[PDB]
Amino acid sequence: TSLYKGVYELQTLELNMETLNMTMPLSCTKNNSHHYIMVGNETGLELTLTNTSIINHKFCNLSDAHKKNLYDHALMSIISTFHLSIPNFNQYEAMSCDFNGGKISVQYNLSHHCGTVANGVLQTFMRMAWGGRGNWDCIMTSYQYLIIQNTTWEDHCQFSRPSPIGYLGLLSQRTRDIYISRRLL
Amino acid sequence: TSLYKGVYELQTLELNMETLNMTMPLSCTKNNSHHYIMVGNETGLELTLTNTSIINHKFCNLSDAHKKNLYDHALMSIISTFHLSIPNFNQYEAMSCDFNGGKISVQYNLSHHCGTVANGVLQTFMRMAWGGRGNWDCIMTSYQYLIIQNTTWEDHCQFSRPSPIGYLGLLSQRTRDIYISRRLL
Amino acid sequence: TSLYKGVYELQTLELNMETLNMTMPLSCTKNNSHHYIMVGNETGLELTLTNTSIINHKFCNLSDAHKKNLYDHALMSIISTFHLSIPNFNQYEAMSCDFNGGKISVQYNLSHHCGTVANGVLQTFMRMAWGGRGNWDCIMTSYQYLIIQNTTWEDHCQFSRPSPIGYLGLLSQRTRDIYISRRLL
Amino acid sequence: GTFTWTLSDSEGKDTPGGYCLTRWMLIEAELKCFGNTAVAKCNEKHDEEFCDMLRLFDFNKQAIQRLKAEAQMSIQLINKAVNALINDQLIMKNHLRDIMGIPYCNYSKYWYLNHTTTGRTSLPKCWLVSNGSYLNETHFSDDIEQQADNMITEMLQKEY
Amino acid sequence: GTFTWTLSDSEGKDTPGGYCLTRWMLIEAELKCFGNTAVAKCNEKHDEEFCDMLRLFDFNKQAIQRLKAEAQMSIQLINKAVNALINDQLIMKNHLRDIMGIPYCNYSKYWYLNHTTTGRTSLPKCWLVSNGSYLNETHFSDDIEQQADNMITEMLQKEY
Amino acid sequence: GTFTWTLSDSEGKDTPGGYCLTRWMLIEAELKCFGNTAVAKCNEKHDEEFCDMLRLFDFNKQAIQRLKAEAQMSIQLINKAVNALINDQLIMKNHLRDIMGIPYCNYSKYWYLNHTTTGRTSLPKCWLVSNGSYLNETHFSDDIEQQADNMITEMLQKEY
Ligand SMILES: O=C(O)[C@H]1O[C@@H](O[C@@H]2[C@@H](O)[C@@H](O[C@@H]3[C@@H](O)[C@H](O[C@@H]4[C@@H](O)[C@@H](O[C@@H]5[C@@H](O)[C@H](O[C@@H]6[C@@H](O)[C@@H](O[C@@H]7[C@@H](O)[C@H](O[C@@H]8[C@@H](O)[C@@H](O[C@@H]9[C@@H](O)[C@H](O[C@@H]%10[C@@H](O)[C@@H](O[C@@H]%11[C@@H](O)[C@H](O[C@@H]%12[C@@H](O)[C@@H](O)OC[C@H]%12O)O[C@H](C(=O)O)[C@H]%11O)OC[C@H]%10O)O[C@H](C(=O)O)[C@H]9O)OC[C@H]8O)O[C@H](C(=O)O)[C@H]7O)OC[C@H]6O)O[C@H](C(=O)O)[C@H]5O)OC[C@H]4O)O[C@H](C(=O)O)[C@H]3O)OC[C@H]2O)[C@H](O)[C@@H](O[C@H]2OC[C@@H](O)[C@H](O)[C@H]2O)[C@@H]1O
Ligand SMILES: *[C@@H]1O[C@H](CO)[C@@H](O[C@@H]2O[C@H](CO)[C@@H](O)[C@H](O)[C@H]2NC(C)=O)[C@H](O)[C@H]1NC(C)=O
Ligand SMILES: *[C@@H]1O[C@H](CO)[C@@H](O[C@@H]2O[C@H](CO)[C@@H](O)[C@H](O)[C@H]2NC(C)=O)[C@H](O)[C@H]1NC(C)=O
Ligand SMILES: *[C@@H]1O[C@H](CO)[C@@H](O[C@@H]2O[C@H](CO)[C@@H](O)[C@H](O)[C@H]2NC(C)=O)[C@H](O)[C@H]1NC(C)=O
Ligand SMILES: *[C@@H]1O[C@H](CO)[C@@H](O[C@@H]2O[C@H](CO)[C@@H](O)[C@H](O)[C@H]2NC(C)=O)[C@H](O)[C@H]1NC(C)=O
Ligand SMILES: *[C@@H]1O[C@H](CO)[C@@H](O[C@@H]2O[C@H](CO)[C@@H](O)[C@H](O)[C@H]2NC(C)=O)[C@H](O)[C@H]1NC(C)=O
Ligand SMILES: *[C@@H]1O[C@H](CO)[C@@H](O[C@@H]2O[C@H](CO)[C@@H](O)[C@H](O)[C@H]2NC(C)=O)[C@H](O)[C@H]1NC(C)=O
Ligand SMILES: *[C@@H]1O[C@H](CO)[C@@H](O[C@@H]2O[C@H](CO)[C@@H](O)[C@H](O)[C@H]2NC(C)=O)[C@H](O)[C@H]1NC(C)=O
Ligand SMILES: *[C@@H]1O[C@H](CO)[C@@H](O[C@@H]2O[C@H](CO)[C@@H](O)[C@H](O)[C@H]2NC(C)=O)[C@H](O)[C@H]1NC(C)=O
Ligand SMILES: *[C@@H]1O[C@H](CO)[C@@H](O[C@@H]2O[C@H](CO)[C@@H](O)[C@H](O)[C@H]2NC(C)=O)[C@H](O)[C@H]1NC(C)=O
Ligand SMILES: *[C@@H]1O[C@H](CO)[C@@H](O)[C@H](O)[C@H]1NC(C)=O
Ligand SMILES: *[C@@H]1O[C@H](CO)[C@@H](O)[C@H](O)[C@H]1NC(C)=O
Ligand SMILES: *[C@@H]1O[C@H](CO)[C@@H](O)[C@H](O)[C@H]1NC(C)=O
Ligand SMILES: *[C@@H]1O[C@H](CO)[C@@H](O)[C@H](O)[C@H]1NC(C)=O
Ligand SMILES: *[C@@H]1O[C@H](CO)[C@@H](O)[C@H](O)[C@H]1NC(C)=O
Ligand SMILES: *[C@@H]1O[C@H](CO)[C@@H](O)[C@H](O)[C@H]1NC(C)=O
Ligand SMILES: *[C@@H]1O[C@H](CO)[C@@H](O)[C@H](O)[C@H]1NC(C)=O
Ligand SMILES: *[C@@H]1O[C@H](CO)[C@@H](O)[C@H](O)[C@H]1NC(C)=O
Ligand SMILES: *[C@@H]1O[C@H](CO)[C@@H](O)[C@H](O)[C@H]1NC(C)=O
Ligand SMILES: *[C@@H]1O[C@H](CO)[C@@H](O)[C@H](O)[C@H]1NC(C)=O
Ligand SMILES: *[C@@H]1O[C@H](CO)[C@@H](O)[C@H](O)[C@H]1NC(C)=O
Ligand SMILES: *[C@@H]1O[C@H](CO)[C@@H](O)[C@H](O)[C@H]1NC(C)=O
User: Fold this and answer.
1) Where in the cell is it found (chains A, B, C)?
2) Range of B119's domain?
């Protein structure tokens, strides 16, 4: 097929990353709009770019979630890494959360010229999923909202192979581009 | 004694780490339950695993301590590194602090299956001291409490040689495994 | 001129760092007391060591600045890096801020023996500017105050060549020497 | 800092010190063994992606055999060891190449030059993906002959 | 981790693979071309300052030609890539040398030994500044002969 | 990034460029001098523990002689320079080996192969501790002959 020089051959590898389901979360997507992160073989999360909002309240009850430790620690760490890698995040009105019962729900409002929270939030989306008219490090999408939410595990990511690299890379940049909101911190 | 090949000899080194007392804090322990960190030749800290609590209030008056800068900066930085390396710390009820007069007192409640603050707190203990039935990256001890407190300097760590490596390694992982408690941060 | 061995010559380079004005902020100073940081070819900041205070209120309205996103993101990130690299910062009374209209104003009170916020603040000053009787890693200056403030771009730094290395190095140490002010964080 | 993890001994008769990938690891390709040279190549290199992946594989294998799965995830190990297993900014470099519009690493397919007669391999490197598709083998043929020349030179130098 | 950025191809006929600095880059010194050896020297070195600077230069050039300036700064790229372009603690080492009172790197002037006949160069290294002034060439003459010996040894070894 | 600190000149006649440990440094063993080769070995290595320790020793010596003790600690220097003196994830690797249950580095005892006739030394490496005790010299004898072979090969190659 692909023979180079006289004997070297372009044999390729397709690493089955499901073998890392027991230690690392894997990212894969279905139709370029439904991205997914699966941790273990029992739980995962939806990442849906859509015009429909499941949440109509501007709250994120994080300290209430930590008070009642009834959630999965892996998922909360995943979303913590996701939220600490958002470049120059400064508008807290956009983010909305739901954690009742241990469910993981996070909605983002991508409403807007550039220098918008939508820019950085899409940036960290493609930092994580690696699946995807904007220029000069500014990206715009017709989708008004994005939803992250808890789900069971299936094989519903035909479009993309599962990979952990998105989360491992996102761990690097957490708290890197954060703004100061208090002097003492 | 230990001769290899024909001329090479297994001569060994026992580095006197007290020579680094003027720049680096040194960790050494006495009876596998009293661990110590000595900074300089004048001040150090107790690390005692015990069933007795010296503190009966669930406070940590950190901003009050910073307001009245009457403490030793080295000790506060030591405990700051210790508290920022606790993996996935999420229950703030456990930690208790006392700083009146510049004294450094920190107590930890190791009450509990796994996924408990005791697991991560023992993890960072053996990250620091390097002196020590739990499995699968979960560790349990019969000791209910642990105490860190100010003390003078003596030679009371027969069990373990003093070494700085615990603190230098702990500096690496600070803020690495932290949970998000606010959107803006 | 400077000939070594028989043919090697000490030819020197003077890198014109203005060619990096479009991606990196450049640091240069005028009279050893007026330091500057220029980002782009349109905006920069004053760093003046002086006995005169432009600000007489002990506030830093950071969350108000993030609410009304009318400022330049580059300048806010610059000052964020500057404030997260201040070693062992513990006295918040000193720092004062003004952000009305997008203007960047930060004043520091260098009032005081050592172990003072002035020590670390001068340390990070010479971390950034690299332009400059104190001993044993303690530095004192007769100047009571320092001012950072917005300005346009000119060539007013005869004393020092513009360089980006101060900010790139300051990015390394951000959040490294920070004190814990809350258990959860 | 840099990575410090070392590869666990692999139960491959042909390759004593080199990580050998089993049937489960490689999709629909049974078992292949790489050798000690290819895996040990990046004990100084910070610009290779596949050997970081096999370090992740070996860390997972160690964590499974020598701890207990317990059916619930322990993210603690991976969050602590991620900087000790893989390079931290190689993913940044590939993200930047992706943003700019040059072909970037997929991190799923890796290509290598299997020496047919002897069975040696270069350390596999990422198959570039661009424009929403894999690059044609013609496009990076030059890189292929680059690696071929590298392999020949390294082998000849080490043999002497 | 460490730096992972690679130098973009430079349009210099004499130096195909080595970053060549144009007129704008060098103050009042027109254009000079370095070569592939000098620029590739620090693909393993973490203790050189000038090649980190030329990596910054090449990153800026890529960001300008292949994106749009838009007249407003994008600090995102530099904040993401700073660890992928330059070493993170070399600046720390020079800050420490400065605090202690030994001559530290300026990061503005760099000196190198231009071979007059052939035009090769050592990788330029920082001209030490102390006491508020540049060190006299007599003071670090020993370092100059150090680099001269290094260049001769490296060249002779590579040629053979 | 990686470490960038360089070893200060040591007042040892036998070893001009190699860090020599004085009486105070070594418990009950007077003074030993290592040499330039052993100390300079890890200017590229990130997997050695003892030379990081002697870099800590040299940093302490510099901080004492060229600053003032003042009788109160300055943690600023060590917190700034820790990444410039030692590797940041080697301690992580030894912590992981400890958790898994394989012998881990103590960081107190280090063993080396002193050449009796000539006085050369390998760079000392950590004496493995396990199960709450030091490993018997029989257990890691294989590693000892590994280092012996390494020393012989390196010496013969460098001499030629
Ligand atoms: O998120 C986010 O991010 C965002 O959000 C948004 O919204 C919101 C939401 O979110 C929600 O929230 C909620 C909440 O509520 C919650 O919380 C909580 C949590 O956290 C938790 O907690 C816990 C607890 O509980 C426990 O216990 C405790 C104990 O511990 C103790 O403690 C203590 C303490 O208390 C203390 O403290 C303090 C200190 O710190 C200090 O302070 C100081 C001061 O003094 C100063 O001064 C200040 C100033 O600053 C000022 O301010 C200002 C203002 O005013 C302004 O405004 C203005 C107006 O007025 C007009 O004029 O218009 C204009 C404008 O501008 O602004 C500015 C700015 O911008 O910034 C500012 O500045 O005045 C005031 C004063 O105060 O300052 C300083 C500094 O800066 O630094 C400071 O420092 O001293 C005092 C004291 O008090 O401390 C102590 C010591 O000593 O240490 C301690 O002891 O006791 C208490 C208890 O409790 O603990 C724990 C631990 O530890 O950890 C904790 O954790 O849990 C509970 C809860 O409650 O959370 C939740 C969740 O998450 O889930 C949530 O839901 O809702 C609400 C809303 O709002 C917001 O908005 C934001 O914020 C922002 O904006 C606003 C403003 O105001 C602020 O500031 C900012 O931040 C956010 O961000
Ligand atoms: C997650 O990965 C693990 C290990 O790679 C899979 O576990 C194996 O599953 C097969 C399925 O029949 C069993 O025969 C093996 O005994 C399992 N091995 C171990 C070590 O558990 C698991 O199947 C994967 N999850 C899913 C949903 O496929
Ligand atoms: C998402 O953001 C958009 C725009 O910021 C919000 O739409 C605004 O809603 C308010 C409240 O009804 C109106 O007064 C504005 O005129 C709307 N602006 C636009 C441009 O539509 C929208 O409400 C946000 N989503 C949610 C769930 O609150
Ligand atoms: C997050 O916390 C807020 C705190 O106010 C919750 O808002 C309260 O919700 C209860 C629920 O019945 C109401 O009775 C209160 O009146 C609400 N507070 C106010 C000020 O109106 C909010 O519900 C929490 N988030 C979720 C998802 O429950
Ligand atoms: C801490 O270490 C320092 C230096 O390693 C020790 O200082 C020496 O102490 C001896 C004791 O007699 C003196 O003779 C030396 O003059 C001291 N040298 C210096 C540079 O100070 C100190 O003793 C150690 N602390 C303790 C408690 O032993
Ligand atoms: C340390 O934690 C234990 C358990 O979480 C605490 O013991 C509880 O104390 C409360 C208050 O009296 C009782 O209502 C519970 O029944 C106790 N539970 C158990 C399991 O003992 C203990 O009080 C904590 N220590 C301190 C100092 O508060
Ligand atoms: C930490 O701060 C809290 C703030 O409430 C202190 O609690 C107060 O202590 C004073 C001391 O006399 C009492 O008069 C107050 O009534 C207490 N507050 C409340 C709400 O009851 C606490 O004492 C501080 N910690 C320490 C160790 O002093
Ligand atoms: C900032 O740097 C840029 C690029 O190094 C300079 O842009 C050039 O400016 C000259 C001035 O006449 C023009 O001829 C070029 O066409 C410009 N090139 C580009 C790519 O923009 C700019 O001048 C510098 N800023 C200032 C204030 O001098
Ligand atoms: C900067 O700090 C100095 C000293 O901390 C402040 O001067 C003090 O001001 C208060 C208020 O008038 C007096 O009660 C003190 O006696 C002053 N002390 C000294 C040493 O002068 C000064 O006010 C601060 N600057 C600002 C703008 O508040
Ligand atoms: C930062 O926030 C504080 C919040 O109190 C502002 O202080 C208020 O300023 C307004 C302005 O007219 C006054 O009406 C209020 O009375 C002030 N608050 C108090 C408690 O007195 C402060 O002005 C803000 N900073 C700036 C520069 O505006
Ligand atoms: C997940 O994997 C474990 C380990 O093989 C297995 O015991 C468990 O049944 C799996 N989960 C499901 C839902 O099959
Ligand atoms: C979401 O809204 C946008 C603009 O309102 C428009 O493209 C369309 O209605 C939705 N987007 C898509 C992709 O359907
Ligand atoms: C790698 O290529 C495969 C080809 O099918 C694709 O499914 C996958 O999404 C690609 N990887 C990424 C991260 O996009
Ligand atoms: C600590 O060491 C210093 C420096 O040698 C010395 O002056 C001081 O007396 C020592 N402290 C005590 C309590 O001996
Ligand atoms: C602390 O309590 C535990 C359980 O209550 C028990 O082992 C003992 O009373 C104490 N532990 C030790 C080591 O004495
Ligand atoms: C190293 O071995 C000695 C032997 O006595 C022991 O005291 C010390 O605790 C060991 N080091 C650590 C970190 O446990
Ligand atoms: C800054 O540089 C850009 C790019 O060359 C140029 O268009 C702009 O006019 C410059 N700004 C000023 C104030 O000249
Ligand atoms: C600022 O005040 C100091 C002390 O009050 C004094 O040196 C002088 O008045 C001012 N400093 C300078 C450099 O003028
Ligand atoms: C480098 O030397 C020049 C010589 O004029 C000087 O202007 C500049 O300030 C020096 N660099 C630094 C960082 O001080
Ligand atoms: C790759 O080759 C196929 C035919 O084998 C062709 O259809 C495709 O367009 C090529 N890719 C590009 C980017 O041109
Ligand atoms: C460097 O040489 C000049 C004369 O060329 C002399 O004036 C100056 O003092 C010298 N520098 C030092 C630090 O002595
Ligand atoms: C090491 O050897 C001693 C005898 O010299 C023996 O008692 C001890 O059990 C040995 N260690 C182990 C782990 O078996």
Assistant:
1) Virion membrane; Host endoplasmic reticulum membrane; Host Golgi apparatus membrane; Host cell membrane
2) 22-173
Question: Roughly how many angstroms between the first and final C-alpha of chain F, as a whole number?
Answer: 34
Please say whether the beta carbons of A71 and A182 come within 8 A. Answer: no
Helix (H) or strand (E) holding A12: strand A8-14
Q: Is the CB of B111 under 6 A from ligand 6?
A: yes
The answer to whether position B83 is within a domain reads yes
* Domain contains A181: no
Nearest to C128 by CA among C9, C19, C35: C35
Which value in Å is the resolution of this experimental model? 3.7
Q: How far apart are CA E20 and CA E17, in angstroms?
A: 9
Query: Strand F20-21 to strand C96-98: parallel, antiparallel, or no bridges (unpaired)?
Result: unpaired
Among the listed residues A34, A25, A43, A44, the one whose alpha carbon sits nearest the alpha carbon of residue A146:
A34
Query: Taken in order A19, A21, A24, A28, is the CA torsion positive or negative?
Result: positive
Residue C163: both structure tokens together: 């360089």
Residue C112 CB neighbours (<10 A): 10
Strand order in the sheet with D125-130: A3-4, A8-14, D104-115, D125-130, D133-134
Coil, strand, or helix at residue A24? coil
Closest-CA residue of chain C to F76: C87
Site to probe by mutation for ligand 11, drawn from A41, A43, A152, A153 as the one with most ligand atoms within 8 Å of Cβ, is A41
Give the whole-angstrom CA distance, residue C183 versus residue C179: 11
> Could you tell me what percentage of chain D is helix, strand and coil, using 3-state DSSP and rounding each to the nearest 5?
40, 15, 45
Selected for mutation to probe chain B from A80, A85, A92, A93 (highest B CB count within 10 Å) is A80
Residue A10 lies in a domain: no
Helix, strand and coil content of chain E, in percent to the nearest 5, comes to: 40, 15, 45
Of E83, E87, E93, which is closest to F5 when you measure between CB atoms? E93
> What is the signed CA dihedral for B105, B109, B115, B121, rounded to 10 degrees?
30
Number of H helices, E strands in chain C: 4, 8
Q: Tell me, yes or no, whether C71 lies in a domain.
A: yes
DSSP string, A77-139: HHHHHHHHTSTT---TTS-EEE-GGG--EEEEE-------HHHHHHHHHHHHT------TT--
F71 Cα: distance to centroid of ligand 14 (angstroms) = 7
Say if the Cβ atoms of A173 and E80 lie within 8 Å: yes
Alpha-carbon span C132 to C140, nearest angstrom: 12
Structure tokens given for F105: 């580095």
Backbone angles phi, psi at D147, to 5 degrees: -65, -35
